[PDB]
Design a binder for these strands. Structure first.
Ligand SMILES: [Mg+2]
Ligand SMILES: [Mg+2]
Ligand SMILES: [Mg+2]
Ligand SMILES: [Mg+2]
Ligand SMILES: [Mg+2]
Ligand SMILES: [Mg+2]
Ligand SMILES: [Mg+2]
Ligand SMILES: [Mg+2]
Ligand SMILES: [Mg+2]
Ligand SMILES: [Mg+2]
Ligand SMILES: [Mg+2]
Ligand SMILES: [Mg+2]
Ligand SMILES: [Mg+2]
Ligand SMILES: [Mg+2]
Ligand SMILES: [Mg+2]
Ligand SMILES: [Mg+2]
Ligand SMILES: [Mg+2]
Ligand SMILES: [Mg+2]
Ligand SMILES: [Mg+2]
Ligand SMILES: [Mg+2]
Ligand SMILES: [Mg+2]
Ligand SMILES: [Mg+2]
Ligand SMILES: [Mg+2]
Ligand SMILES: [Mg+2]
Ligand SMILES: [Mg+2]
Ligand SMILES: [Mg+2]
Ligand SMILES: [Mg+2]
Ligand SMILES: [Mg+2]
Ligand SMILES: [Mg+2]
Ligand SMILES: [Mg+2]
Ligand SMILES: [Mg+2]
Ligand SMILES: [Mg+2]
Ligand SMILES: [Mg+2]
Ligand SMILES: [Mg+2]
Ligand SMILES: [Mg+2]
Ligand SMILES: [Mg+2]
Ligand SMILES: [Mg+2]
Ligand SMILES: [Mg+2]
Ligand SMILES: [Mg+2]
Ligand SMILES: [Mg+2]
Ligand SMILES: [Mg+2]
Ligand SMILES: [Mg+2]
Ligand SMILES: [Mg+2]
Ligand SMILES: [Mg+2]
Ligand SMILES: [Mg+2]
Ligand SMILES: [Mg+2]
Ligand SMILES: [Mg+2]
Ligand SMILES: [Mg+2]
Ligand SMILES: [Mg+2]
Ligand SMILES: [Mg+2]
Ligand SMILES: [Mg+2]
Ligand SMILES: [Mg+2]
Ligand SMILES: [Mg+2]
Ligand SMILES: [Mg+2]
Ligand SMILES: [Mg+2]
Ligand SMILES: [Mg+2]
Lengths: 258, 158, 134
RNA sequence: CGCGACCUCAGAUCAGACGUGGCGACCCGCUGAAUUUAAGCAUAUUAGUCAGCGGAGGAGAAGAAACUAACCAGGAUUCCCUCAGUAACGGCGAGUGAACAGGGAAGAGCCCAGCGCCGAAUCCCCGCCCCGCGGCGGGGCGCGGGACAUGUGGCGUACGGAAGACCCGCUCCCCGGCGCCGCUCGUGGGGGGCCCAAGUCCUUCUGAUCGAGGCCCAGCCCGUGGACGGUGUGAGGCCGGUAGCGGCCCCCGGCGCGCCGGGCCCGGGUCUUCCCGGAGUCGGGUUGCUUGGGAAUGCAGCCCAAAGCGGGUGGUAAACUCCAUCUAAGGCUAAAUACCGGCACGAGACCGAUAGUCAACAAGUACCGUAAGGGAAAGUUGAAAAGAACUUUGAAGAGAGAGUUCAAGAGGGCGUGAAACCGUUAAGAGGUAAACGGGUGGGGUCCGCGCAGUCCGCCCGGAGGAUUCAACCCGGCGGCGGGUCCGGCCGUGUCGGCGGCCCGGCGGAUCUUUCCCGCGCGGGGGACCGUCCCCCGACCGGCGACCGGCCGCCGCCGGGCGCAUUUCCA
RNA sequence: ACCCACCCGACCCGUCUUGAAACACGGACCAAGGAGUCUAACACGUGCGCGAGUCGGGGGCUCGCACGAAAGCCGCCGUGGCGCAAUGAAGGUGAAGGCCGGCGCGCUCGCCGGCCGAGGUGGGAUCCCGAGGCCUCUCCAGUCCGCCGAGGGCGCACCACCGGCCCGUCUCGCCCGCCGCGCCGGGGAGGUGGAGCACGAGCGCACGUGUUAGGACCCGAAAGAUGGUGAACUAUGCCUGGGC
RNA sequence: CGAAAGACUAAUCGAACCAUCUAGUAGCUGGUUCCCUCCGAAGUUUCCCUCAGGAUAGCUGGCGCUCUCGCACACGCAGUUU
RNA sequence: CCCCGGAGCCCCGCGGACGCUACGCCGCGACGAGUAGGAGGGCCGCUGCGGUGAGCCUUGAAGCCUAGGGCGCGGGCCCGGGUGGAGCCGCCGCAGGUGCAGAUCUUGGUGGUAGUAGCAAAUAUUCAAACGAGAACUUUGAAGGCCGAAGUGGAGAAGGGUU
RNA sequence: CGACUCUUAGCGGUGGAUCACUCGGCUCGUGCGUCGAUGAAGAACGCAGCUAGCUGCGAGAAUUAAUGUGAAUUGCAGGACACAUUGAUCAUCGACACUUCGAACGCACUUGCGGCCCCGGGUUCCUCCCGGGGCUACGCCUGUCUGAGCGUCGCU
């Protein structure tokens, strides 16, 4: 809010003794606004309580190493179709979920080419859905240039723009990310981890260089490895009915004395 | 009031700080602006190093920084004299000259000299007209490069 | 999307720019399309409509095939009045119902030197687009 | 008793110039509180801050050391990070509070006075001619005037300079014009103009559709264009736009070439001989302010008042003594930096008419106050005025009909139309004010039934009808699972190849300059070590990491199986 | 859930208050608005990333920013902060000890070789060993699997305690060192001060709660300051007219 | 300004009015906005230009941690008593 | 002295819920006053952003009304009918100018008071006629009255600003 | 049953909450970064066929010219124009124009007095009279002219 807001009067509070209510009141006149109360956050006119400042701490910051961890997590659950399906991405007829395309796609220069590529990969249903989602936003956003809203559709991770990003552009839903410049906000929208992705061989081969194996640095991000896992065999069903564990357990008391 | 254990602390919010708070919503813009102007300085000074002028090796002062080495303001007069450069010309071939620098130690003196010797070597002085006189370098080293040097010229490695 | 950073997308700023647009700009705004017979011939999509271009209404109540002559354009009100597109008041006197150029279609232009040249411009810059795309 | 020089000083509606006020976000120069805090209060603090006055510019101010340091030393100002909430100050309380060094943005340096040399070599102004002329300029020519020796101009200024001899090497820089060529980064600099994709397709709701269903591949078309807005609802494809190293037209800049007119005979080193610096300024006292600056950080008034191997500084006063380090008392300087005022743009996790600016509207308006000054309220018919013709009652306001509208249960302060409050209609009640908690009962209101609700679902038995199969084999397809790990792909741990090692890269304070290249160092080889890859054999976890056969089992399709089977139906 | 009936119960809320139905204050009614915020700084807790590190700023490199004033990257990656060292006003100093064998007279002192290498006591989650059983359809033999385990061990973390080390200081002592033999330098033993050491736990971000500094939960003085506007009323002086 | 009453100075006077410093300061009055669940006080300590306020302990809550054994196989602790 | 792809089962070690959102589900006990104050959980609630419901909406969104039907201990919510006429919501996260009975609170609106208090300073009105929809009040005539030339008469200054 | 009162609902009012709109704000950012004696800012008074205010303009007064645009403006009138023509209307804006106060400038603030040059009527330069035009501020700079002084000197 403006600093001034509310202090553009000369309101002296009438003292006590004139009945009334000890607010600062608009000095003088034969206007309507003539002893109406001012300043106080209760008062019409008045001044909002603890006004908003610019120097509120809007921006926040995050360790580099975490951001990277985040982006890994995200890329990992771009695989794992369950998650991607749970994030909604209609990915039923897609062929192999780290979904990589020849790099003639790098240099398409027309939408039509792009759209036909999606239909051949069977991603087109995601778009189809994006289209369908396109509907009006509810509330004051409307009056603030956030009037239409829709899904997020497939990402397309390209190694270099040889045209491509022009081709996939009007197709609603789609994003493009350079690999060498990934982004969480787009890989994991809403901070929801699954995302349907379409990689391009060149980009996809560049991942191991960008983030490293476990037994090699990034070799591109200075000094960086992928994170470690805290428990290896995530699938504990297999663990629990292993030999070695179920050998050594007391037997299950499961009768119920009521 | 204080309340049981924790830094007594004097914070300086007694004058009208709110009148004079400085917010950094500029910054990004300003990173952009400066950069543009930077790029435009390069494109102006076509083949000259964008960096600017060659600057000399120099030790920092004080028992602390002592051991580290920096860039200087410009090469001192002894150092030009010895390398065989006229002081008013040095400004014109991309050589920073400060004149206020004393030169105490013979070692630094010869280091900087060795820079200027090095520099003049790896310099591609264009001629005044396209019609070539002396000094101005050969049409070979001119066609093969009217090329800049991005980054400080002869970078000062400690 | 748009990309040009000197243009708006800004409900309010567009609307002001439309509602407080001046007449020579409202010429461009109150443009209407050419029926497919003309569209073929002149190789033009659309033309700023004018005082006596014959016209078919396409949408609304008056929606029909009845090729009326435009009577008058009321650029103040963004609206054109058309030969027989009218309704009786309570006292009998007829009144032209305002139709909005975009829900109309031009069936016969009122060609003069200037208009002819415009359609010659639009064809030209179209075919340059087609030659560039080829 | 004149005339003449100059000097100091007047007057002019003398000729031509210029300053005057404003705006004031940012900047510079003064001036300068008190609320406040210290739980009182006086120094301190608030604060060199508000208010006051002055003066600026697109920036200002600053700035080319009388600097820092004390190091192996750095090298104008500004700005950011850091230093540092530190050194320091402070009723050593509350509170205050920098600086160098280090890393960054940017980066640019200079000119006088003096000391000297040059016939004043300089300047301003008048008048004629040629060019040029909307930022009054160039060339020529005048015994045309003045300024100037009480000192103009070139050279030169502390980084040293001047003048001499002979060592060397050689001779392009500027401006006033006039042309002409390449339209010169948001990917054609700036401004302006005008143009450029694709459905109103088929049914169907609707008052009206931009809706809904469909359209040779989610359907047709475009899509470097699916931003936005408009259009009788919700629109990529109706219109404007949007996109695009897209088009044309103007106008303007900026740089490239040519010609003319002028100016301009403009170096460096080496040895000799000369030359060298800002006074009521420094410095001391002092008082007052000021500072973090503490026996005085700065700035002042007054008194005193210098020097030249001097002068200043060297964060504890003073003397002696070495070192260091600058050169004060004259001046100019872009650049990073600032910007709640202005012109013009974009954007927002902001506000949504008691909000948001006082102000969405004829608002700094109405109105108030003598005046300074104060200072509101106030948005919304409908898609379209189609804003209710006409009859009728009434002096009219008002109605009654009629009509427009999808709607006037939208009728010109008219969207929605809450509550408080009132009028009426209906129902119920009524001497302990009303209202309330718990417990029932009576009545009302609607809701659910039932014109049996006897509610379903298995399995079974029986009596009636019903088609086709289960069971069984045969053919095909698919799935699961499995071991012989059988054959092959696949990968973990180990061992063998020292095999990738140079046909495997990176790293290393491991070495070697026997190497190479560039100048004891830099780069590249070359060794060494660490780390990552090929080849086969063997053992083992045979791991959801897969194929192929084979086996076993499941399911599906199609054959046959005609009725003690098989489902259906009652 | 609407009305009505009756029995029983039943004082009007808000607030300060030892005590409110009060002859305490606020409140006729209704609508909308209306009060613990934000920045900074600490503290402790908690979540994440990394770990003797950590760190991002500030800057820079990548684009006309549609989304980007983002995101990514940097021998700047670390100038620098904070941490890895303390103590003393300062000059300054600055965290190890043991054993064994030998040489100096083992002198609980001085100098030379070898081995171990953060000390010890009590308690300590946990781990390890485990006599022994307890059966098996027979009499014994007898490997395998357990169940428990009397008893004994290594013992995290933390606590109590003892020694030990560094800095300051005292006491008392006797030796050693050299380019400078000195108002030099270095040690020892014993007390005592320290926000110490004694095989590291920090850094970055986020959330919370607390405590301040800020308008600082909202509203409230009497005052204080700066700079202006008024003598049309009124107070007095003067000028020029009127009146009784 | 006052033949003086602290009178008068534009309904204002023991210091006019207007605007700004200013959202001045307040140990003092007043208010301080949804539900359930759980635990649940103090009005005493010492110091205070302290006595309508703070500090400090006390009382409250929250967060935990280290251990303990009803898993036939327990040590410590108490508004008691002997 | 035999195998569960079959002992037939009160126990089954061959495979295992109808059950198992392991932030789930199940079983035993004991317990339950609360200002100031603290803490927990809210599938309580309000506005906006990232995600997400192939969500809802002119065949009717929001809002408003409701002697309709229900849920929830509650905060609150879901349904039915009406009105209205354009937008809105569930879930997972993020953000906050997020919940009112009071503050002699601010603004606006409304009651009771109440058809009440009041329309009582300066002696005074009456008769006829006109106009007119309409006359206690307008105008005309008559009568009775007053101000009583220091005026309720005629004229100016200041002030007003078209009266 | 009656009147009144209270309660509830239905319909009417009262009032304008709610919701939904938004040519307005508020915030952050970018680029320029320009006033004035050649009369600024601001003030006043004027100007439309019908116009009060707002806005826009200056006695050429809702605007002239010029360029670009290419048929309107529109509340009603009335008109023009040949929209095969410098051409409606818009926009731009380079030319032209810009009443009175105001730093405000002849002196005064009454709109009150003036001075001096030039023109037309008025004369027949006869001054008057009227009307018009141009000058008439302060401070300051360079030059010019005219001067001042028992200021310092020179020759007579
Ligand atoms: Mg407000
Ligand atoms: Mg809403
Ligand atoms: Mg640089
Ligand atoms: Mg005080
Ligand atoms: Mg106090
Ligand atoms: Mg006091
Ligand atoms: Mg001060
Ligand atoms: Mg000021
Ligand atoms: Mg000025
Ligand atoms: Mg300057
Ligand atoms: Mg200087
Ligand atoms: Mg620090
Ligand atoms: Mg201070
Ligand atoms: Mg000279
Ligand atoms: Mg189009
Ligand atoms: Mg629309
Ligand atoms: Mg659209
Ligand atoms: Mg002071
Ligand atoms: Mg000293
Ligand atoms: Mg200067
Ligand atoms: Mg409003
Ligand atoms: Mg309103
Ligand atoms: Mg308002
Ligand atoms: Mg509203
Ligand atoms: Mg409307
Ligand atoms: Mg309304
Ligand atoms: Mg309706
Ligand atoms: Mg309506
Ligand atoms: Mg209405
Ligand atoms: Mg009623
Ligand atoms: Mg009744
Ligand atoms: Mg009491
Ligand atoms: Mg009582
Ligand atoms: Mg009270
Ligand atoms: Mg009361
Ligand atoms: Mg409210
Ligand atoms: Mg923590
Ligand atoms: Mg604390
Ligand atoms: Mg307050
Ligand atoms: Mg606070
Ligand atoms: Mg106050
Ligand atoms: Mg005082
Ligand atoms: Mg008190
Ligand atoms: Mg508890
Ligand atoms: Mg309890
Ligand atoms: Mg009290
Ligand atoms: Mg309880
Ligand atoms: Mg509408
Ligand atoms: Mg908000
Ligand atoms: Mg209320
Ligand atoms: Mg009465
Ligand atoms: Mg009388
Ligand atoms: Mg009279
Ligand atoms: Mg009279
Ligand atoms: Mg309204
Ligand atoms: Mg209103």
């Amino acid at each position: 809010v403006s600093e001034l807001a509310g202090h553009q009067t000369s309101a002296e509070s009438w003292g006590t003794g004139r009945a009334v209510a000890r607010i600062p009141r608009v000095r003088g006149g034969g206007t309507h606004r003539s002893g109406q109360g001012a300043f106080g956050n209760m008062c019409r006119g008045g001044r909002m309580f603890a006004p908003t400042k610019t120097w509120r701490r809007w921006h926040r910051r995050v360790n580099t190493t975490q951001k990277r961890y985040a982006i890994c997590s995200a890329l990992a659950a771009s695989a794992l179709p369950a998650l991607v399906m749970s994030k909604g991405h209609r990915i039923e007829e897609v062929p192999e979920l780290p979904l990589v395309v020849e790099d003639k796609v790098e240099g398409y220069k027309k939408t039509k080419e792009a759209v036909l590529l999606l239909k051949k990969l069977k991603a087109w249903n995601d778009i189809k859905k994006v289209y369908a989602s396109q509907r009006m936003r509810a509330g004051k956003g409307k009056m603030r240039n956030r009037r239409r809203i829709q899904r997020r559709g497939p990402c397309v991770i390209y190694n270099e723009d040889n045209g491509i990003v022009k081709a996939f552009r009007n197709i609603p839903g789609i994003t493009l990310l350079n690999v060498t410049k990934l982004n969480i906000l787009k890989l994991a929208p809403g901070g929801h981890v699954g995302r349907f992705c379409i990689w391009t061989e060149s980009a996809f081969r560049k991942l191991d260089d960008l983030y490293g194996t476990w037994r090699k640095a990034a070799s591109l991000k200075s000094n960086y490895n992928l994170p470690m896992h805290k428990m290896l065999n995530t699938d504990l069903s297999r663990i629990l009915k292993s030999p070695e564990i179920q050998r050594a357990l007391r037997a299950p008391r499961k009768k119920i004395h009521r | 009031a204080p309340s049981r254990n924790g830094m007594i602390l004097k914070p300086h919010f007694h004058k009208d700080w709110q009148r004079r708070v400085a917010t950094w919503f500029n910054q990004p813009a300003r990173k952009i602006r400066r950069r543009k102007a930077r790029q435009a300085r390069a494109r102006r000074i076509a083949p000259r190093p964008a960096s600017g002028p060659l600057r000399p090796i120099v030790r920092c002062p004080t028992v602390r920084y002592h051991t580290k080495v920096r860039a200087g303001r410009g090469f001192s007069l002894e150092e030009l004299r010895v390398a065989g450069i006229h002081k008013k010309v040095a400004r014109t071939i991309g050589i920073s000259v400060d004149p206020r620098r004393r030169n105490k130690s013979t070692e630094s003196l010869q280091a900087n000299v060795q820079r200027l010797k090095e520099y003049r070597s790896k310099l591609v002085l264009f001629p005044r007209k396209p019609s070539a006189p002396k000094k101005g370098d050969s049409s070979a080293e001119e066609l093969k490069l009217a090329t800049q040097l991005t980054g400080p010229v002869m970078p000062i490695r400690n | 999307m748009k990309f040009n950073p000197f243009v708006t997308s800004d409900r309010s700023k567009n609307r002001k720019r439309h509602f407080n647009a001046p007449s020579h700009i409202r010429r461009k705004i109150m443009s209407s399309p050419l029926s497919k017979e003309l569209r073929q011939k002149y190789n033009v999509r659309s033309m700023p409509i004018r005082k006596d271009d014959e016209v078919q209404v396409v949408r609304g109540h008056y929606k029909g095939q009845q090729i009326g002559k435009v009577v008058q354009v009321y650029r103040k009100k963004y609206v054109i009045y058309i030969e027989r597109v009218q309704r009786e008041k309570a006292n009998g006197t007829t009144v032209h119902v305002g139709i909005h150029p975009s829900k109309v279609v031009i069936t016969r232009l009122k060609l003069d030197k200037d208009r002819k040249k415009i359609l010659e411009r639009k064809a030209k810059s179209r075919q340059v687009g087609k030659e560039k795309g080829k």
